[PDB]
Amino acid sequence: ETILEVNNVPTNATSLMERLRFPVSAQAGKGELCAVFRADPGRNGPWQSTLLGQLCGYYTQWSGSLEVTFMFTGSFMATGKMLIAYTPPGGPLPKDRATAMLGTHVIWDFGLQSSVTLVIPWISNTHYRAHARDGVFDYYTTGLVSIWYQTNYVVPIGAPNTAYIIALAAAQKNFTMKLCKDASDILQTGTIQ
């Protein structure tokens, strides 16, 4: 497992360390949305910060199940529940929680165990997937992952109103790759003297 940069919004040098976690706080109770990201390890985005993405960058095709783990780093007095849903390919970005509940999902309750795991099972028509990108090659999308509020973020008097979540990603035991190639990015701008 390695840290997954779901919150890849900031780009300043001082704010580069803020990409490693995303916040959670008290809401109005409507079942609001927290974050969304794609499930393609080889595509550009959050998965480029993991070791799995870097290693899969050298291979054209892959096959297998993935695993994502979220750890809650709030105070001991905070409670809450969340819904994390995975939408198989072909479905648009869910508009609300009612549509997001129709895919594979898990409900996470904060407590003594601070982490939960979401498994992204292998659902595809072909045995292998090639690397997907905008255009014709979006034939190989894996789907989307969304995080919704289940009930609320409840906290007593005297504890901070905002907490943070760390996401860790890895692969399962059926993961394989083939057809070795070269990495898309070369880290050299001229002559290395």
Partner: protein, 245 residues
Amino acid sequence: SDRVAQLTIGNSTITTQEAANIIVGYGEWPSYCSDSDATAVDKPTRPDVSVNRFYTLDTKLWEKSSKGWYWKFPDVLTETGVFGQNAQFHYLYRSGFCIHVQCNASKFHQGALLVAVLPEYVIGTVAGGTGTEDSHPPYKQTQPGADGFELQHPYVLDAGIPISQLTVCPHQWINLRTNNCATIIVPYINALPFDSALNHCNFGLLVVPISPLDYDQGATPVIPITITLAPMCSEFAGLRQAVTQ
């Protein structure tokens, strides 16, 4: 051991770390209809994983002055997904259910809820206030849909029966001091092997705050309540056109 639990059915999962065991209603598990009980001749359909999975309906806010709410089954799920499509395409219906109610707070909040299941929960009216007018409740009150309905006279359960005897029905409590969830499993309850899902409601779910919510100013004032349910051992028969009404 009895505090932590996991429920897996279909492609959905629920994890909890504060529980008070699972109630199996009337000491019986859901099952399919036998040949001796069955009456229709056509073979039923059993879509399995596409209909037996957890559904979440809506979120309701708990206030210091709340009365209570109630839902009707299977009226909530007649418009949701493959279960709704199957229910409105066929004539006959049968299934069990699994009900999970969630409500969490802090260690400085207090309160209590009663979650009960009452078969054939018929709703009465106030008869104009004097007992002279023979009125009947509108369709909105009898089958409120997936949004539920709020009780007006929780003491008489809006039907003329005391609430203090509701514990005779399969029930649990949600004490904010002890737990934050309640799980009940209900078999198929009816005097017939099959029935219509658009004309008959098997039972109802009641959530009534017996002990009022309290907290000191400065804590979180929003305490939501969420309902999650999943059909078990669903069967359909009598295929025809699709009717919604």
